[PDB]
mmCIF file of C-alpha atoms in Angstrom:
data_model
loop_
_atom_site.group_PDB
_atom_site.id
_atom_site.type_symbol
_atom_site.label_atom_id
_atom_site.label_comp_id
_atom_site.label_asym_id
_atom_site.label_seq_id
_atom_site.Cartn_x
_atom_site.Cartn_y
_atom_site.Cartn_z
ATOM 1 C CA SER N 1 66.791 84.975 92.355
ATOM 2 C CA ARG N 2 67.434 84.683 88.379
ATOM 3 C CA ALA N 3 70.599 86.801 89.032
ATOM 4 C CA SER N 4 71.345 85.639 92.187
ATOM 5 C CA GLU N 5 71.638 82.441 90.683
ATOM 6 C CA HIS N 6 73.301 83.085 87.319
ATOM 7 C CA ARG N 7 76.913 81.942 87.453
ATOM 8 C CA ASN N 8 80.818 80.111 86.557
ATOM 9 C CA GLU N 9 81.778 76.546 85.743
ATOM 10 C CA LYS N 10 82.854 77.711 89.769
ATOM 11 C CA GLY N 11 79.810 78.581 91.630
ATOM 12 C CA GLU N 12 81.235 81.801 91.506
ATOM 13 C CA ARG N 13 78.217 84.100 91.048
ATOM 14 C CA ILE N 14 78.489 86.202 87.596
ATOM 15 C CA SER N 15 76.844 89.075 86.303
ATOM 16 C CA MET N 16 74.712 89.319 84.318
ATOM 17 C CA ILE N 17 76.379 91.699 81.620
ATOM 18 C CA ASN N 18 78.846 91.082 81.776
ATOM 19 C CA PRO N 19 79.925 86.941 81.908
ATOM 20 C CA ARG N 20 84.473 87.394 82.581
ATOM 21 C CA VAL N 21 82.580 89.008 85.401
ATOM 22 C CA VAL N 22 83.195 88.081 88.658
ATOM 23 C CA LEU N 23 80.732 89.196 92.092
ATOM 24 C CA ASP N 24 80.464 88.534 95.414
ATOM 25 C CA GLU N 25 77.094 87.452 97.369
ATOM 26 C CA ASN N 26 75.640 90.658 96.843
ATOM 27 C CA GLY N 27 76.093 91.365 93.047
ATOM 28 C CA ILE N 28 78.909 94.346 93.616
ATOM 29 C CA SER N 29 81.973 93.775 91.969
ATOM 30 C CA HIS N 30 85.614 93.791 93.418
ATOM 31 C CA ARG N 31 87.613 96.239 91.352
ATOM 32 C CA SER N 32 84.395 98.743 89.773
ATOM 33 C CA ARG N 33 81.580 99.374 92.511
ATOM 34 C CA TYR N 34 79.083 102.328 92.696
ATOM 35 C CA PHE N 35 77.657 104.214 94.239
ATOM 36 C CA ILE N 36 74.220 106.829 93.768
ATOM 37 C CA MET N 37 74.066 110.329 94.621
ATOM 38 C CA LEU N 38 70.030 111.681 95.144
ATOM 39 C CA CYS N 39 71.066 116.146 94.182
ATOM 40 C CA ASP N 40 68.393 118.024 95.122
ATOM 41 C CA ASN N 41 70.247 120.892 95.218
ATOM 42 C CA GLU N 42 71.170 122.505 91.867
ATOM 43 C CA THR N 43 73.362 124.688 92.453
ATOM 44 C CA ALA N 44 75.417 122.242 94.712
ATOM 45 C CA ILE N 45 75.673 120.109 90.966
ATOM 46 C CA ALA N 46 77.017 123.275 88.956
ATOM 47 C CA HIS N 47 79.802 123.631 91.517
ATOM 48 C CA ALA N 48 79.977 119.876 91.986
ATOM 49 C CA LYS N 49 80.493 119.753 87.811
ATOM 50 C CA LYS N 50 82.418 123.074 87.366
ATOM 51 C CA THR N 51 85.058 122.534 90.242
ATOM 52 C CA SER N 52 84.577 118.175 90.336
ATOM 53 C CA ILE N 53 84.217 117.997 94.491
ATOM 54 C CA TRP N 54 81.709 115.666 96.206
ATOM 55 C CA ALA N 55 80.368 115.303 100.108
ATOM 56 C CA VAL N 56 79.574 112.394 101.943
ATOM 57 C CA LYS N 57 77.523 111.831 103.944
ATOM 58 C CA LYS N 58 78.210 109.977 107.180
ATOM 59 C CA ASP N 59 76.324 108.066 106.745
ATOM 60 C CA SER N 60 78.111 106.104 104.094
ATOM 61 C CA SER N 61 81.273 107.348 104.339
ATOM 62 C CA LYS N 62 82.393 103.823 106.351
ATOM 63 C CA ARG N 63 81.722 101.490 103.274
ATOM 64 C CA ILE N 64 83.235 104.350 100.640
ATOM 65 C CA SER N 65 86.363 104.766 101.691
ATOM 66 C CA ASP N 66 87.109 101.019 102.094
ATOM 67 C CA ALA N 67 85.188 101.062 98.675
ATOM 68 C CA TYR N 68 87.856 103.333 97.461
ATOM 69 C CA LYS N 69 90.957 101.804 98.847
ATOM 70 C CA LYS N 70 90.035 98.306 97.279
ATOM 71 C CA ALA N 71 88.911 99.047 94.145
ATOM 72 C CA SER N 72 87.160 101.327 91.458
ATOM 73 C CA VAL N 73 84.773 104.059 92.614
ATOM 74 C CA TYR N 74 82.271 105.289 90.381
ATOM 75 C CA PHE N 75 79.603 107.991 91.327
ATOM 76 C CA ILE N 76 76.028 108.261 89.881
ATOM 77 C CA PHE N 77 74.144 111.110 90.015
ATOM 78 C CA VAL N 78 70.576 111.333 89.882
ATOM 79 C CA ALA N 79 67.952 114.311 90.591
ATOM 80 C CA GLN N 80 65.740 113.376 94.155
ATOM 81 C CA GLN N 81 62.751 114.394 92.452
ATOM 82 C CA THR N 82 62.271 112.907 89.144
ATOM 83 C CA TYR N 83 65.958 110.748 89.271
ATOM 84 C CA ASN N 84 66.592 112.789 86.248
ATOM 85 C CA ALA N 85 70.166 111.564 85.640
ATOM 86 C CA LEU N 86 73.327 113.579 86.764
ATOM 87 C CA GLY N 87 75.924 112.328 85.341
ATOM 88 C CA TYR N 88 78.461 109.714 86.895
ATOM 89 C CA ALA N 89 82.736 109.991 88.103
ATOM 90 C CA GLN N 90 84.940 108.641 89.334
ATOM 91 C CA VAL N 91 86.370 109.024 92.175
ATOM 92 C CA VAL N 92 90.016 110.361 91.641
ATOM 93 C CA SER N 93 91.276 110.770 96.141
ATOM 94 C CA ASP N 94 89.598 109.440 99.812
ATOM 95 C CA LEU N 95 87.567 111.650 102.617
ATOM 96 C CA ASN N 96 89.005 115.096 103.126
ATOM 97 C CA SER N 97 86.918 116.179 105.819
ATOM 98 C CA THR N 98 88.877 119.546 105.489
ATOM 99 C CA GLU N 99 87.501 120.194 101.154
ATOM 100 C CA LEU N 100 84.228 120.725 101.760
ATOM 101 C CA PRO N 101 82.160 122.510 99.232
ATOM 102 C CA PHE N 102 80.065 125.560 100.143
ATOM 103 C CA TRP N 103 76.279 123.434 99.644
ATOM 104 C CA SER N 104 77.933 120.651 102.582
ATOM 105 C CA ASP N 105 76.161 120.907 106.400
ATOM 106 C CA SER N 106 76.433 118.760 109.065
ATOM 107 C CA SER N 107 75.334 115.505 107.744
ATOM 108 C CA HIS N 108 78.927 115.035 105.928
ATOM 109 C CA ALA N 109 81.595 113.876 107.177
ATOM 110 C CA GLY N 110 84.177 115.342 103.927
ATOM 111 C CA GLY N 111 84.367 116.078 100.885
ATOM 112 C CA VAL N 112 86.049 114.189 98.169
ATOM 113 C CA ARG N 113 87.433 114.897 94.865
ATOM 114 C CA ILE N 114 85.845 113.181 91.817
ATOM 115 C CA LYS N 115 86.745 113.211 87.728
ATOM 116 C CA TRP N 116 83.771 112.874 86.170
ATOM 117 C CA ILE N 117 83.722 111.037 83.431
ATOM 118 C CA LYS N 118 80.016 112.125 81.530
ATOM 119 C CA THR N 119 77.690 115.216 82.899
ATOM 120 C CA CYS N 120 74.032 115.662 81.419
ATOM 121 C CA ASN N 121 70.161 116.731 83.232
ATOM 122 C CA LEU N 122 68.222 114.183 81.279
ATOM 123 C CA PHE N 123 65.367 111.848 81.606
ATOM 124 C CA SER N 124 65.584 108.272 80.831
ATOM 125 C CA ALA N 125 62.998 106.297 82.454
ATOM 126 C CA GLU N 126 65.340 102.830 82.695
ATOM 127 C CA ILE N 127 67.556 104.979 84.879
ATOM 128 C CA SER N 128 64.475 106.001 86.528
ATOM 129 C CA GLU N 129 63.072 102.585 87.011
ATOM 130 C CA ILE N 130 66.127 101.257 88.668
ATOM 131 C CA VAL N 131 66.030 103.768 90.823
ATOM 132 C CA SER N 132 63.344 103.609 92.094
ATOM 133 C CA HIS N 133 63.980 99.612 92.609
ATOM 134 C CA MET N 134 67.659 99.871 93.645
ATOM 135 C CA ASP N 135 67.452 99.274 97.693
ATOM 136 C CA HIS N 136 65.907 95.515 97.506
ATOM 137 C CA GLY N 137 63.272 96.783 94.871
ATOM 138 C CA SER N 138 62.234 100.324 96.841
ATOM 139 C CA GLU N 139 63.695 103.824 95.935
ATOM 140 C CA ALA N 140 67.773 103.913 96.166
ATOM 141 C CA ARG N 141 68.708 105.477 99.712
ATOM 142 C CA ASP N 142 71.513 108.969 98.680
ATOM 143 C CA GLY N 143 74.939 107.127 98.732
ATOM 144 C CA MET N 144 74.171 103.070 99.049
ATOM 145 C CA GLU N 145 75.894 101.106 96.990
ATOM 146 C CA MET N 146 74.199 99.255 93.523
ATOM 147 C CA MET N 147 75.240 95.412 92.528
ATOM 148 C CA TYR N 148 77.825 95.668 89.672
ATOM 149 C CA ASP N 149 74.887 94.749 86.591
ATOM 150 C CA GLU N 150 73.254 97.980 87.852
ATOM 151 C CA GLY N 151 75.600 100.489 88.010
ATOM 152 C CA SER N 152 76.938 98.977 84.746
ATOM 153 C CA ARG N 153 73.490 99.995 82.867
ATOM 154 C CA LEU N 154 73.027 103.191 84.246
ATOM 155 C CA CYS N 155 76.275 103.879 83.156
ATOM 156 C CA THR N 156 75.143 102.363 79.446
ATOM 157 C CA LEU N 157 72.126 104.760 79.350
ATOM 158 C CA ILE N 158 73.610 108.113 80.444
ATOM 159 C CA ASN N 159 76.245 107.719 77.515
ATOM 160 C CA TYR N 160 73.400 106.899 74.932
ATOM 161 C CA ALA N 161 71.030 109.525 76.211
ATOM 162 C CA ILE N 162 74.043 111.647 75.482
ATOM 163 C CA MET N 163 74.400 109.874 72.184
ATOM 164 C CA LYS N 164 70.596 110.305 71.210
ATOM 165 C CA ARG N 165 71.094 113.345 72.172
ATOM 166 C CA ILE N 166 73.296 114.719 69.338
ATOM 167 C CA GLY N 167 72.018 112.474 66.864
#
């Protein structure tokens, strides 16, 4: 609990990576919010990367729409079996039950439009570690919200991994 007690002078929790970012007491930023998508279907991700659409499950739809209305929301995409990084995107529309992708099913409340920031298919060991511990030390649940510092690390690690493969 050295993260949870990392504070400014006023006792507000702050990010460990960016001290300018104030967090609530679950380590979440008011302005940039991050959700993990565990991808088990190569055809779905190929479709999502081409058409900039994703499906939101019923178990996480309410939290995701709450966040979309209050902050910038990002989805970080990771292969289910390996935690390979697949990319990250900003959510740029609210849930639309009419615009679901072909691969969705009754577990999904609706679709959202996204704007891709990075796309790749790469293993990053540090990405895998973060995802392995995202649910209070246990492995991530699909669609869960992560802490600001987790999202910021994942995005940088994806950016760095892509950058390094070009070289």
